[PDB]
Write an enzyme that holds these catalytic residues in place. Structure first.
Site, PDB file in Angstrom:
ATOM      1  N   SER A 183      34.013  45.872  53.975  1.00  0.00           N
ATOM      2  CA  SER A 183      34.142  47.294  53.679  1.00  0.00           C
ATOM      3  C   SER A 183      32.869  48.068  53.991  1.00  0.00           C
ATOM      4  O   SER A 183      32.920  49.295  54.124  1.00  0.00           O
ATOM      5  CB  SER A 183      34.519  47.495  52.211  1.00  0.00           C
ATOM      6  OG  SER A 183      35.812  46.975  51.945  1.00  0.00           O
ATOM      7  N   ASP A 202      42.096  35.911  44.223  1.00  0.00           N
ATOM      8  CA  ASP A 202      40.717  35.559  44.538  1.00  0.00           C
ATOM      9  C   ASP A 202      39.795  35.815  43.354  1.00  0.00           C
ATOM     10  O   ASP A 202      38.767  35.142  43.213  1.00  0.00           O
ATOM     11  CB  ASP A 202      40.241  36.334  45.766  1.00  0.00           C
ATOM     12  CG  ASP A 202      40.877  35.839  47.050  1.00  0.00           C
ATOM     13  OD1 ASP A 202      41.155  34.625  47.152  1.00  0.00           O
ATOM     14  OD2 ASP A 202      41.100  36.665  47.958  1.00  0.00           O
TER      15      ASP A 202
HETATM   16  N1  LIG Z   1      34.072  48.559  47.314  1.00  0.00           N
HETATM   17  C1  LIG Z   1      34.469  47.310  47.574  1.00  0.00           C
HETATM   18  N2  LIG Z   1      35.066  47.060  48.760  1.00  0.00           N
HETATM   19  C2  LIG Z   1      35.465  45.814  49.029  1.00  0.00           C
HETATM   20  N3  LIG Z   1      35.363  44.720  48.271  1.00  0.00           N
HETATM   21  C3  LIG Z   1      34.767  44.996  47.107  1.00  0.00           C
HETATM   22  C4  LIG Z   1      34.302  46.231  46.687  1.00  0.00           C
HETATM   23  N4  LIG Z   1      33.738  46.137  45.422  1.00  0.00           N
HETATM   24  C5  LIG Z   1      33.871  44.869  45.116  1.00  0.00           C
HETATM   25  N5  LIG Z   1      34.481  44.120  46.088  1.00  0.00           N
HETATM   26  C6  LIG Z   1      34.743  42.684  46.071  1.00  0.00           C
HETATM   27  O1  LIG Z   1      35.435  42.361  44.879  1.00  0.00           O
HETATM   28  C7  LIG Z   1      35.016  41.047  44.470  1.00  0.00           C
HETATM   29  C8  LIG Z   1      35.372  40.820  43.014  1.00  0.00           C
HETATM   30  N6  LIG Z   1      36.818  40.804  42.759  1.00  0.00           N
HETATM   31  C9  LIG Z   1      37.151  41.207  41.386  1.00  0.00           C
HETATM   32  C10 LIG Z   1      36.497  42.498  40.921  1.00  0.00           C
HETATM   33  C11 LIG Z   1      36.875  43.725  41.727  1.00  0.00           C
HETATM   34  N7  LIG Z   1      38.289  43.742  42.071  1.00  0.00           N
HETATM   35  C12 LIG Z   1      39.154  44.611  41.552  1.00  0.00           C
HETATM   36  O2  LIG Z   1      38.831  45.460  40.725  1.00  0.00           O
HETATM   37  C13 LIG Z   1      40.576  44.492  42.044  1.00  0.00           C
HETATM   38  C14 LIG Z   1      41.211  45.846  42.311  1.00  0.00           C
HETATM   39  N8  LIG Z   1      40.488  46.524  43.406  1.00  0.00           N
HETATM   40  N9  LIG Z   1      40.123  47.709  43.264  1.00  0.00           N
HETATM   41  N10 LIG Z   1      39.881  48.778  42.936  1.00  0.00           N
HETATM   42  C15 LIG Z   1      37.488  39.551  43.095  1.00  0.00           C
HETATM   43  C16 LIG Z   1      37.762  39.359  44.529  1.00  0.00           C
HETATM   44  C17 LIG Z   1      37.907  39.155  45.696  1.00  0.00           C
HETATM   45  C18 LIG Z   1      38.007  38.849  47.080  1.00  0.00           C
HETATM   46  N11 LIG Z   1      37.303  37.915  47.689  1.00  0.00           N
HETATM   47  C19 LIG Z   1      37.674  38.021  49.021  1.00  0.00           C
HETATM   48  C20 LIG Z   1      37.246  37.336  50.173  1.00  0.00           C
HETATM   49  N12 LIG Z   1      36.324  36.367  50.167  1.00  0.00           N
HETATM   50  N13 LIG Z   1      37.792  37.697  51.355  1.00  0.00           N
HETATM   51  C21 LIG Z   1      38.703  38.674  51.370  1.00  0.00           C
HETATM   52  N14 LIG Z   1      39.182  39.389  50.349  1.00  0.00           N
HETATM   53  C22 LIG Z   1      38.620  39.017  49.195  1.00  0.00           C
HETATM   54  N15 LIG Z   1      38.832  39.555  47.940  1.00  0.00           N
HETATM   55  C23 LIG Z   1      39.713  40.673  47.633  1.00  0.00           C
HETATM   56  O3  LIG Z   1      38.942  41.812  47.311  1.00  0.00           O
HETATM   57  C24 LIG Z   1      39.785  42.732  46.579  1.00  0.00           C
HETATM   58  C25 LIG Z   1      39.015  43.301  45.411  1.00  0.00           C
HETATM   59  O4  LIG Z   1      38.653  42.288  44.483  1.00  0.00           O
HETATM   60  C26 LIG Z   1      41.061  41.961  46.212  1.00  0.00           C
HETATM   61  O5  LIG Z   1      42.131  42.357  47.062  1.00  0.00           O
HETATM   62  C27 LIG Z   1      40.672  40.500  46.464  1.00  0.00           C
HETATM   63  O6  LIG Z   1      41.786  39.698  46.844  1.00  0.00           O
HETATM   64  C28 LIG Z   1      33.534  41.018  44.811  1.00  0.00           C
HETATM   65  O7  LIG Z   1      33.077  39.681  44.985  1.00  0.00           O
HETATM   66  C29 LIG Z   1      33.474  41.812  46.124  1.00  0.00           C
HETATM   67  O8  LIG Z   1      33.503  40.951  47.258  1.00  0.00           O
END
Ligand SMILES: [N]C1=N[C]=NC2=C1N=[C]N2[C]1O[C]([C]N([C][C][C][N]C(=O)[C][C]N=N=[N])[C]C#CC2=NC3=C([N])N=[C]N=C3N2[C]2O[C]([C][O])[C]([O])[C]2[O])[C]([O])[C]1[O]
Ligand SMILES: [N]C1=N[C]=NC2=C1N=[C]N2[C]1O[C]([C]N([C][C][C][N]C(=O)[C][C]N=N=[N])[C]C#CC2=NC3=C([N])N=[C]N=C3N2[C]2O[C]([C][O])[C]([O])[C]2[O])[C]([O])[C]1[O]
Ligand SMILES: [N]C1=N[C]=NC2=C1N=[C]N2[C]1O[C]([C]N([C][C][C][N]C(=O)[C][C]N=N=[N])[C]C#CC2=NC3=C([N])N=[C]N=C3N2[C]2O[C]([C][O])[C]([O])[C]2[O])[C]([O])[C]1[O]
Ligand SMILES: [N]C1=N[C]=NC2=C1N=[C]N2[C]1O[C]([C]N([C][C][C][N]C(=O)[C][C]N=N=[N])[C]C#CC2=NC3=C([N])N=[C]N=C3N2[C]2O[C]([C][O])[C]([O])[C]2[O])[C]([O])[C]1[O]
EC number: 2.7.1.23
Lengths: 264, 264, 264, 264
Positions: free
Chosen positions: A166, A45
């Site tokens: 998160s 990603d």
């Molecule tokens: N605390 C916290 N928690 C949670 N989250 C967070 C934090 N801060 C920041 N963040 C993210 O990140 C991004 C950016 N980066 C790169 C740089 C940094 N990194 C590193 O170092 C590695 C080792 N680690 N450690 N130490 C890229 C990316 C991405 C993404 N996108 C998505 C969607 N749409 N859905 C579901 N999953 C996903 N992913 C995943 O995430 C992890 C980390 O990546 C891995 O498994 C991957 O597949 C910014 O934009 C913010 O969002």
């Protein structure tokens, strides 16, 4: 059609890219990284977010495809063993496109009140450099709260499975044109008070973050930082622009969520 | 126009109701609790939810108004001192209506697979009678998770400030046609796994709760319980029906949120 | 007895300090900021944390007292109007002392494996400079988890109402000799996994934080930062040292919690 | 020594029990389920909690051992393949005992203010029968909060990995003689207010739950319910009694936590 392929950079991704390029050479497909109509991201990603920002100026003329050389990604939803079938089905065409909402971030800075704008595929965050900072939260020109804490995160729908998750935010289906604001360690006592809950805003609602005392902090857009100083305002709103995905088979969002967080 | 007034039942609410009835008697306004076009709720949000379900069969022909004789409510957004001005502006008319989304709850029960349907203004919940229970969560006919815990809550947008909020759910603006599913004390270890995060579903998505072992539990819709036994499925989807509010001045949702949770 | 008075620095605190100094001049009390036996902090909890670290080398020979010129503090639990009664009761003496546990933070850094040690009254935190960082968590020499996220916070009992509380940690009565570890926005998916819950450790347990890739980050101890680079380990354990408070009346911890978070 | 063996009841557990009984028949070990000195539980944590309450009157004369025929348990920390080695090492003896704290629950009920007492190994909970209920929380005879919500959970240290964990509570090492109170979906707005955070109480602190309006609700102690009506008070305190485990090798609590929640 004109296409280009970005690579995570390791041996596995560079090798699949070269094999796909050789496969595309057998059709009416031209490699062009200046004006591509198809952008293929081979990696995670993080690689996909790189490709998005690499072509954030031609979003309406590009369909993105992600291939994950490691684990399944939320944007890289093709396995490397299906790369030949991808080249084949991509060569013919007639595929459908799927559009996800984006987040517009406007930063007002300087003495001249200059405004720089950015697009986020995952989220934009405002965070204190060190310790807690203070920011006034203004929603549609009405003062909502004075936030004291580590920072704030404004996520797109497809971004809700990332930083937003998160921070306790809800997972939103990408067909919902909205943005979600989550808190990072807010101070709450008798004197200081925030809503605490994540907030989900529809289109045309504008959330304005106005720092109170210190005027220097960290602004992020996806995997990078917005480099502007003497900031006076960060405005958030659902963008009128969308990212377009080239889809070749049904891979529903909730199954993608299940595969990435429940079990695969 | 035909109108009726529900009362919380204490001296203060009954008295305001009688004074408003006397005020309406000075205009072309008829008291009719069988086919009212205007329903005024004098009390709290509990009184308002009562009025909603009292007329849930004529929702498209009714505009609701809430007056809070105690603290500010999310549905009762008129102060008692403005009751005369309410009667006056309501008498003339020409007010605008505002519509909030609703939640359709379908309960499949019995040997004949009978299906009873309900509308929720706040939320519908499925909860274990005692201890934890097990329910399979199916989203658009794909199995998403096997939930083990105390229960699940599916909230409307305007309901997100109620039970949903206490379960960690996000606050959603009522212009978003969606529903939000939150968990109540889910078991999560090496063997048992849920998504944990709240889930926000758009229109036309169907969430099906299918209890695994025990088939007897508590189903709630707003402030009451759905009395059907031998349940095989509880299906959730955004209703095609909406609740209509008669609005006479700007009282934005986020200011209502600020006034009820931040400070007033 | 030898005493000194720290001031927040505004007009109100400086003025109360000068009046208390004049009051102490009427008894066998000597002002000494080099070897004080009594340290009075006039201001907020930030002023009190400053006084603590200002004399962290003579903790066993000092009894602290806090006066809050603004709102009630958790360490500043005297009102300014009681300053005369404080001088009077402090002058005579025969008061009881109350001891709270502290947190020892050891930082291993450099090529020579040098170790700097610090004492925290509230907490010590390890946080990523930018974005998420990776740290291995080792408890009594066994690897417990690989943390990926924004950072970690290790709090004392009296610190549990501070940063710890905003991170979802539990409030612990200061008679419990323990430390509590809370997470800051941990990444949790199929590949990455943390315990999520706060962890409470007894005396003699050692929690070791060992950063994996990047070796440069932010270490905090209460309101300040530990300035050492090329860090290889941050070890946490309940200190053998304690902070001593001079108490003149019953102000239980839970009432202090109630007054600061529920209502006062 | 006198011993007995409880079984989960399935074929696998009943079979291991009979084989262990045959193994014990080769030593100076007598089967006695009236006055056993050793209680072996073959099954899950539910089977172990059953054995605990089955002999809660002779806790100081019994050492418990748990064998998990399925997945690893927090109390059943022996694998079935080690049953012979268990019989052998148990036969000789000279093992060390390990003690965990318990929770005393006192229920005041009736017109005569009768008081029934219970011991909990995991937790005791007070929960509303239907909807939310109201209970005043009194800590050491001072009123702390008026709780409005689904219920409250008071956990032992070893119980913190169970219901407590699902409610956001902290994980506490069982060497800490304490109890932890967590909330179940508390209502928090401008009018109603709870602390929200989990609370950890040392020995000799007494937490009193006093229901306000409705006086009929559900009281749980581990896997069962306390059947007494017309309740006026539920008092919680760390018990003076402890559960004793027979340990034959090092299996630290934090490794047990890691194995059950992180990965095994
Ligand atoms: N605390 C916290 N928690 C949670 N989250 C967070 C934090 N801060 C920041 N963040 C993210 O990140 C991004 C950016 N980066 C790169 C740089 C940094 N990194 C590193 O170092 C590695 C080792 N680690 N450690 N130490 C890229 C990316 C991405 C993404 N996108 C998505 C969607 N749409 N859905 C579901 N999953 C996903 N992913 C995943 O995430 C992890 C980390 O990546 C891995 O498994 C991957 O597949 C910014 O934009 C913010 O969002
Ligand atoms: N746990 C939890 N948490 C949270 N929440 C909840 C819970 N459970 C339940 N819930 C809710 O509720 C409702 C119902 N009810 C009535 C009945 C019950 N009650 C009683 O009792 C009283 C006392 N208390 N106690 N104890 C009515 C109502 C309502 C409402 N609505 C809203 C919105 N929308 N927003 C915001 N807010 C709101 N509200 C509020 O809420 C509270 C309670 O009400 C009060 O203030 C009111 O104003 C169901 O529906 C669910 O939601
Ligand atoms: N996020 C988050 N959340 C939460 N928390 C936190 C955070 N971060 C951090 N933190 C804390 O802090 C401290 C330090 N500082 C100073 C500096 C900073 N600050 C400033 O700026 C001001 C403004 N704000 N803003 N923006 C001092 C102090 C203290 C304390 N202590 C305590 C206890 N023990 N308990 C209870 N409470 C308490 N406190 C409080 O807190 C707040 C803040 O302070 C105030 O009210 C005060 O009274 C470190 O240590 C950590 O803990
Ligand atoms: N919501 C929520 N959440 C959380 N938790 C909870 C709840 N509720 C309740 N709870 C718990 O639980 C217990 C009891 N039981 C039995 C009965 C019930 N059950 C059943 O059904 C089964 C199926 N399920 N479902 N649906 C027994 C036991 C136990 C235990 N213990 C422990 C410790 N200590 N640590 C850790 N882990 C643990 N465990 C676990 O847990 C689960 C459930 O068990 C399983 O895995 C087991 O191994 C009460 O006591 C409370 O705590």
């Amino acid at each position: 059609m004109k296409y280009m392929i970005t690579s995570k950079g390791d041996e596995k991704s560079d090798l699949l890219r070269l094999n796909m390029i050789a496969g595309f050479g057998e059709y009416d497909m031209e490699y062009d990284d200046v004006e591509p109509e198809i952008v293929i991201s081979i990696g995670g990603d993080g690689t996909f977010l790189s490709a998005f920002h690499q072509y954030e100026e031609r979003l309406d003329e590009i369909a993105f495809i992600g291939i994950h050389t490691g684990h399944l990604g939320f944007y890289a939803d093709w396995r490397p063993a299906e790369a030949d079938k991808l080249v084949k089905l991509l060569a013919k065409g007639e595929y459908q496109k799927v559009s996800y909402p984006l987040l517009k971030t406007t930063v007002k800075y300087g003495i001249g009140k200059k405004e720089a704008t950015y697009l986020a595929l995952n989220e934009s965050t405002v965070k204190s450099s060190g310790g807690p900072f203070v920011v006034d939260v203004v929603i549609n020109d009405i003062h909502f709260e004075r936030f004291r804490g580590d920072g704030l995160c404004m996520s797109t729908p497809s971004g809700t499975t990332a930083y937003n998750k998160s921070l306790g935010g809800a997972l939103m289906h990408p067909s919902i044109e909205a943005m979600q604001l989550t808190e990072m360690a807010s101070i709450n006592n008798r004197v200081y008070r925030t809503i605490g809950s994540p907030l989900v805003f529809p289109k045309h609602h504008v959330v304005s973050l106005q720092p109170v005392n210190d005027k220097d902090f960290q602004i992020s857009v996806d995997h990078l930082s917005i480099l502007h100083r003497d900031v006076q305002e960060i405005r958030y709103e659902v963008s009128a622009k969308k990212i377009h995905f080239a889809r070749f088979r049904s891979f529903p969002f909730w199954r993608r969520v299940h595969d990435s967080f429940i079990e695969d």
